mmCIF file of C-alpha atoms in Angstrom:
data_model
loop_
_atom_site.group_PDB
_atom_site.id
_atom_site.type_symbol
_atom_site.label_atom_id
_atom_site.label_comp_id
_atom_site.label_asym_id
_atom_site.label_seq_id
_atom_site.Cartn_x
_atom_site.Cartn_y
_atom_site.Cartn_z
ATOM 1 C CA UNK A 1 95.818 86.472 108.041
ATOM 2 C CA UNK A 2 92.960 87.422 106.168
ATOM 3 C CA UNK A 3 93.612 89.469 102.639
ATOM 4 C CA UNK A 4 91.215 90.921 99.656
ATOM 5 C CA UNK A 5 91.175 91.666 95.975
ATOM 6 C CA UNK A 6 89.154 94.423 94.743
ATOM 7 C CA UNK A 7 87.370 93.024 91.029
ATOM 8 C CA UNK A 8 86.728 95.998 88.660
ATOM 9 C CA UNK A 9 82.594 94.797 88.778
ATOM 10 C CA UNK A 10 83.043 96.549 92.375
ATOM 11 C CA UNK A 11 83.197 92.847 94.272
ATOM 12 C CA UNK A 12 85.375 92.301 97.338
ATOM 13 C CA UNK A 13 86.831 89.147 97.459
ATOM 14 C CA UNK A 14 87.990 87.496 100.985
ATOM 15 C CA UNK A 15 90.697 85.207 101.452
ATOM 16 C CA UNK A 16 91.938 83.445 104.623
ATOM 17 C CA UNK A 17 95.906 82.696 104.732
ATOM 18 C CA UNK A 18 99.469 82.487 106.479
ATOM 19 C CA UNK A 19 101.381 85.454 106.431
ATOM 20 C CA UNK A 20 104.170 82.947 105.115
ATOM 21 C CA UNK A 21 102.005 81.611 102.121
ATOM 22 C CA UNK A 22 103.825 81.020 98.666
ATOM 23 C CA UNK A 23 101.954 83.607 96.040
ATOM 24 C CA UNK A 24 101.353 80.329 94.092
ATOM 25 C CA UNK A 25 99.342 78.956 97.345
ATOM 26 C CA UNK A 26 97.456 81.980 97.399
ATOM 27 C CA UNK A 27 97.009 81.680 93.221
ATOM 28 C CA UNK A 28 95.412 78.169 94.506
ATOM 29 C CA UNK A 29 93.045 78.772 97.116
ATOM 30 C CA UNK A 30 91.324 81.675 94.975
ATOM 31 C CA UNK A 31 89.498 79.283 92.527
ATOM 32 C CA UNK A 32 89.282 76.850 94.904
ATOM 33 C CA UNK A 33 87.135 79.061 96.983
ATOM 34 C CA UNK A 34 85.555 81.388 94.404
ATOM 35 C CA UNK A 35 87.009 80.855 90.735
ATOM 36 C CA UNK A 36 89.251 83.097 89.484
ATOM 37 C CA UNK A 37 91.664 81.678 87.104
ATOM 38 C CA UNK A 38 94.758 83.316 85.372
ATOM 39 C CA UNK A 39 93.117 82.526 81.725
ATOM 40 C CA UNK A 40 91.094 85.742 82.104
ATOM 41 C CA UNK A 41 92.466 88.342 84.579
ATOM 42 C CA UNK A 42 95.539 89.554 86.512
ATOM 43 C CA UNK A 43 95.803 90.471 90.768
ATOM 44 C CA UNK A 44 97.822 93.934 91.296
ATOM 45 C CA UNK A 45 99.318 95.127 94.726
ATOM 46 C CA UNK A 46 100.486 98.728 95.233
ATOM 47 C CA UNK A 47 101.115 99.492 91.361
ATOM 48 C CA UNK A 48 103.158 95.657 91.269
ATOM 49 C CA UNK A 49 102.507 92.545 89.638
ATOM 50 C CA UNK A 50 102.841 89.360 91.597
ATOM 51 C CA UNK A 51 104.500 85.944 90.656
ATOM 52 C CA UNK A 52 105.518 82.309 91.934
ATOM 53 C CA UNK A 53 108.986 81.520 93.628
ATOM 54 C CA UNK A 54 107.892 84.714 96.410
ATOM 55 C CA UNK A 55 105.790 85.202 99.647
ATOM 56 C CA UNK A 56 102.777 87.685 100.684
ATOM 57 C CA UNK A 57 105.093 89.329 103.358
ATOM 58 C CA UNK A 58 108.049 89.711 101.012
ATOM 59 C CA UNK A 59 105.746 91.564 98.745
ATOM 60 C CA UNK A 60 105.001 93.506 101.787
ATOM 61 C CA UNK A 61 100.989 92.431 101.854
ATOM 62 C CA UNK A 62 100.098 92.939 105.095
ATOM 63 C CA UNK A 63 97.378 91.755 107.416
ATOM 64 C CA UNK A 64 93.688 93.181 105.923
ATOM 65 C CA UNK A 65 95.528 94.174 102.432
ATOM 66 C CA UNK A 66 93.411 94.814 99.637
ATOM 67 C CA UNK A 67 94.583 93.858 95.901
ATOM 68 C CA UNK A 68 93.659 95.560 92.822
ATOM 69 C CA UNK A 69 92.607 93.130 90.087
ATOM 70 C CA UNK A 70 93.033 93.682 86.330
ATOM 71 C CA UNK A 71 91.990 91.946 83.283
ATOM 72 C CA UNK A 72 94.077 90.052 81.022
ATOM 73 C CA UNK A 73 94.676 91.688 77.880
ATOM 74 C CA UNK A 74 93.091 91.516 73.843
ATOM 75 C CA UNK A 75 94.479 90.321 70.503
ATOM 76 C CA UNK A 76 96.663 88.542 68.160
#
């Protein structure tokens, strides 16, 4: 399976995966391979926020899926 996640500087990132993977293996390989940590930012799908414990194809990502990113947010 190959996925994406759409930054908000208008950069496609490409990931290559198992349709079974763990979102924590997927959480892994993207700093691994390009170096985005959780520290600064936060990866959207369909309006959804996506966390540990699940899969890809529970969260229904599909094959070629693209991923909003956001930030992580500002204060104190």
């Amino acid at each position: 399976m190959q996925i994406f996640v759409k930054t908000l500087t208008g950069k496609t990132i490409t990931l290559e995966v198992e349709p079974s993977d763990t979102i924590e293996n997927v959480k892994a390989k993207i700093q691994d391979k390009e170096g985005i940590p959780p520290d600064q930012n936060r990866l959207i799908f369909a309006g959804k926020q996506l966390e540990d414990g699940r899969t890809l194809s529970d969260y229904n990502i599909q094959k070629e899926s693209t991923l909003h990113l956001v930030l992580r947010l500002r204060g104190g």
